[PDB]
């Protein structure tokens, strides 16, 4: 049968257990001889395992690559204090009597502490608090309650040095060094009944085991030895540390057997203690770390376990996996959000293991008969007994003829196969989704554009990874849970994440704007491009020059479901009167006539009645990320598959619109007439005059301190406020003098790409350059640059750039903008590390929380963190703008459904 590890019990290894688990005794501080063979009794002994392929292990008889490795033991001449337990040892040394060995507590106190230990349960914090309280109470008693022997304070010196404060016959206070043998002898006197009071297990954590008498040398496999390209074997750091330990132990044994004086024995004991302490942890405080002959410090077991590169993080929590690829991504609007572009070279390398059944026997037989060099083919074949055979040209037909039910065929990646698509860093669960394999003959990955905002991935050389599940359970889990269309709504804010961006928004605005009409050929072409099932063209809206014309709203209406009705305001609202009139007309009748709506239709108010876009222009508020109301309603009211189809169709339609109608930006997009430039210059002169007046008022002393502030930062804040008002006025002038016919203004207003400030910065001014939230001050004495007078606090001398990008900046203003950009870049480069550390901390704090079947969130111990998740038991992904149920939307939709 099969068994799993139900629980793990920790403890301290006893010397008897170390001796029993050891397959050999190590006494030679060497690894290999001149010819390269292992030395008997050495660290590289075959009894501890084999790394070289030729050798065969003595203990288990297995060759390299399959021998698990066997531990050894070293009999230390003298006991050595374990550093990791050392401080804990001191605690026990402050809790037990030096003669009787019992704890320094009364019987009643011991019993009361036993009841306290039994009552509280299994919470770790209470146990540590009780242990600390018991240690503090026992450490202040100088008389043993059981024997009456006097006690002395014990001073702990890092890392493994113990001093006992003793008194001579003359009353002088001196320090006696407690040798590890004396410490172990004192620890041996503590009975098993007092161990729970000290936080030690009677049968698993005996204090005498905290002092090392037998050192467990690791197996050969866990510290492997390799041969370099120069023919010289490269030993591990642990091997060198163990060589030093064995040499020092042998020297100590020889000196002890020779009757060496006490000066020799304690010196060698200290050397062995230092070696063992470095072997346990080379980064111990208060000691010099062990270094190689080249001056490189070694990393021992503690550094192997801890750290980012340690076993826990670099090998256990996260590790490299098989059947994975990684390459650059390129855009592909022609594929669905469910599909990923897999290169042919990647597809012919990564293989899906498919078992031969009664329905896929012919397909897998054809895959085997194609071979690894022909697509679609196979690379490996596994028989039911379990031998894997690689398919070459010779046995390609023979294996195909031998194929039967129960065999496994590692076939090439085919269309429709489910694979994982992950981009690093993975800040959220939406950073990986299961896509469908689409095989194309190029070299790069291809990912659909609406799936990019979930990945936070652009196409400026982004690298993305792909993982192919092997087991059927993993493939099913990827297909059902982590499918792309199932994660359109972001659980972080309950809004659309998989959404149209940039050119999708621009094409939607171009199609759905007022006065946008298309010919019959254009309408048929966009219908075919978007893959819509429109068999017959709708009635044309108007006839121009004898030919029919279709409104873009009519074409957009075919995407929406026939029973959809929603009205809202978008970001293109600048005349609230028309929007208010439309809202009032909708409010009275609740089913306004389409002719009545079209009479007073406004691009700033989106209104869809029965799937017909009667008014409004498409922008980021329609199906953009974090703002699309239409996409949010479509996902929640019509499922995810219909939402995915709508997203694909609308993205293709908008791409067709933006491709053939013509979308471009030029140098005249930021061009302004002479009146706008004159107004901007007037604003500049007014701002500099106000700044100079403020400076003069501060100099003459009539400037008023702000409440709680002195002259300097008050004047600085006033100057910054004046410059901000000037920047706002310049931006308002630029917006006034730039119409909606501008493509850059279209992109800024519709929310496709960029902002209004971006156009303002390229046309009107750059504003004031600020560092760390204040004006630029770092530089020379009294000035930032030497081109200004010292002590000048003017706008031009402190980072206020008057000209824009189109007019070109002065060298001083260019330098100030460089300081601002450098500050921004440093801000992001500093923020990323802190954000990642905080994310890791939060994840490790909340990794184990899970909603149970009764709706309660509990920790693995059993403590109910929440009796109901979110206090209402509602998924934030399925929540409506952070609310439980959108009563307004439900009522309106139901009323419209019953009225229609």
């Amino acid at each position: 049968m099969k068994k799993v590890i139900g629980s793990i019990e920790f403890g301290i290894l006893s010397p008897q257990e170390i001796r029993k688990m050891s397959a050999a005794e190590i006494t030679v501080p060497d690894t290999y001889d001149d010819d390269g063979y292992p030395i008997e009794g050495g660290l590289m002994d075959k009894r501890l395992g084999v790394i070289d392929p030729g050798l065969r292990c003595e203990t288990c008889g297995a060759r390299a690559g399959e021998c698990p490795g066997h531990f050894g033991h070293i009999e230390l001449a003298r006991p050595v204090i374990h550093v990791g337990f050392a401080k804990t040892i001191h605690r026990v040394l402050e809790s037990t009597c030096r003669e009787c060995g019992r704890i320094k507590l009364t019987d009643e106190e011991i019993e009361e502490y036993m009841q306290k230990f039994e009552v509280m349960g299994d919470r770790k914090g209470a146990v540590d608090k009780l242990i600390k309280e018991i240690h503090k109470k026992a450490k202040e008693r100088m008389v043993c309650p059981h024997c009456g022997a006097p006690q002395f304070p014990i001073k702990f010196e890092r890392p493994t040095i113990y001093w006992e404060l003793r008194k001579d016959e003359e009353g002088n206070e001196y320090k006696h060094r407690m040798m590890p043998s004396e410490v172990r002898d004192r620890l041996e006197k503590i009975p098993d009944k007092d161990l729970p009071l000290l936080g030690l297990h009677p049968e698993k954590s005996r204090p005498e085991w905290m002092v090392l008498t037998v050192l467990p040398v690791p197996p050969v496999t866990m510290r492997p030895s390799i041969t370099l390209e120069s023919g010289i074997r490269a030993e591990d750091d642990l091997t060198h540390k163990l060589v030093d330990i064995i040499r020092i132990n042998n020297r100590l044994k020889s000196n002890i057997e020779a009757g060496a004086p006490q000066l020799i024995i304690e010196d060698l004991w200290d050397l062995l203690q230092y070696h063992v302490t470095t072997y346990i942890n080379n980064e111990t405080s208060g000691v010099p770390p062990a270094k190689h002959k080249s001056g490189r410090p070694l990393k021992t077991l503690a550094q192997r376990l801890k750290g980012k590169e340690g076993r826990f993080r670099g090998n256990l929590s996260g590790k490299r996996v098989n059947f994975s690829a990684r390459t650059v991504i390129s855009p592909d609007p022609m594929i669905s959000i469910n599909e990923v572009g897999v290169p042919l070279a990647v597809a012919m390398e990564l293989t899906v293991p498919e078992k031969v059944t009664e329905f896929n026997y012919e397909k897998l037989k054809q895959r085997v008969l194609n071979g690894p060099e022909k697509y679609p083919g196979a690379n490996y074949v596994i028989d039911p007994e379990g031998r894997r055979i690689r398919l070459m040209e010779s046995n390609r037909e023979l294996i195909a003829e031998k194929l039967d039910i129960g065999w496994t065929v590692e076939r090439h990646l085919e269309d429709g196969d489910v694979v994982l698509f992950n981009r690093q860093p993975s800040l959220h669960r939406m950073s990986i989704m299961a896509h469908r394999v689409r095989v194309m003959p190029y070299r790069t990955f291809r990912l659909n554009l609406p799936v990019c905002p979930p990945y936070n991935a652009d196409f400026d050389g982004d690298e993305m990874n792909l993982h192919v599940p092997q087991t059927e359970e993993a493939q099913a889990e990827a297909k059902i849970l982590m499918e792309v269309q199932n994660h359109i709504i972001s659980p972080r804010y309950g809004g659309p994440l998989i959404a149209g961006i940039q050119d999708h928004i621009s094409g939607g605005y171009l199609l759905t704007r007022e006065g946008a009409y298309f010919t019959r050929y254009e309408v048929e072409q966009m219908l075919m491009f978007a893959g819509m099932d429109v068999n017959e063209l709708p009635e044309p809206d108007k006839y121009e020059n004898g030919e029919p014309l279709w409104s873009g709203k009519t074409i957009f209406s075919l995407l929406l479901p026939d029973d959809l009705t929603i009205w809202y305001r978008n970001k293109l609202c600048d005349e609230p009167e028309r929007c208010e009139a439309l809202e009032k007309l909708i409010e009275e009748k609740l089913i306004p006539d389409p002719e009545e709506v079209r009479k007073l239709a406004y691009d700033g108010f989106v209104y869809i009645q029965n799937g017909k876009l009667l008014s409004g222009a498409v922008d980021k508020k329609a199906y953009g990320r974090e703002d699309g109301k239409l996409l949010d309603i479509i996902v929640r009211e019509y499922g995810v598959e219909r939402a995915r189809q709508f997203l694909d169709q609308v993205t293709k339609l908008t791409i067709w619109v933006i491709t053939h109608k013509g979308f471009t930006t030029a140098i005249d997009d930021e061009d302004l007439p002479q009146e706008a430039i004159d107004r901007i210059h007037e604003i500049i002169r007014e701002a500099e005059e106000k700044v100079q007046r403020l400076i003069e008022a501060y100099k003459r002393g009539e400037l008023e301190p702000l409440p709680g502030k002195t002259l300097e930062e008050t004047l600085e804040s006033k100057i910054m406020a004046v410059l901000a008002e000037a920047r706002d006025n310049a931006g308002k002038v630029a917006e006034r003098y730039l119409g909606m016919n501008n493509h850059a203004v279209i992109m800024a207003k519709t929310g496709a790409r960029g902002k209004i400030l971006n156009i303002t910065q390229m046309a009107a001014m750059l504003g004031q350059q600020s560092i760390r939230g204040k004006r630029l001050y770092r530089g020379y004495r009294g000035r930032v640059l030497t081109h200004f007078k010292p002590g000048d606090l003017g706008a031009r001398a402190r980072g206020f750039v008057t000209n824009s990008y189109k007019s070109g900046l002065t060298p001083q203003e260019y330098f100030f903008h460089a300081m601002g950009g450098r500050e921004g870049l440093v801000d992001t480069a500093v923020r990323t590390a802190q954000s990642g550390y905080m994310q890791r901390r939060l994840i490790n704090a909340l990794q184990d929380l899970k909603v149970d079947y009764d709706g309660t969130v509990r920790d693995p111990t059993g403590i109910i963190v929440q009796f109901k998740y979110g206090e209402d038991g509602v998924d934030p992904m399925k929540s409506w703008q952070g609310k439980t149920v959108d009563v307004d939307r439900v009522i309106v939709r139901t009323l419209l459904k019953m009225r229609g």
Partner: protein
């Protein structure tokens, strides 16, 4: 975005989740009763009651002599 003195943003979130005993630039929001929330004079007087003013801040010049020491 990194960087009155509310120290908001990522450092504020880090301070909150780390359970800092003394947050950087602590700020308290104080509300007044019906007898002090409608006029400026009572609000100023209760603010000066809350405000901890030491004579060192009120002092303008610092000078230590020797004749009276």
């Amino acid at each position: 975005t990194l960087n009155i003195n509310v120290t908001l943003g990522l450092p504020r979130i880090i301070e909150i989740v780390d359970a800092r005993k003394n947050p950087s630039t602590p700020i308290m929001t104080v509300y007044l009763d019906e007898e002090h929330r409608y006029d400026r004079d009572k609000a100023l007087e209760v603010a000066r009651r809350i405000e901890g003013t030491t004579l060192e801040n009120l002092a303008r010049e610092e000078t230590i002599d020797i004749l009276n020491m």
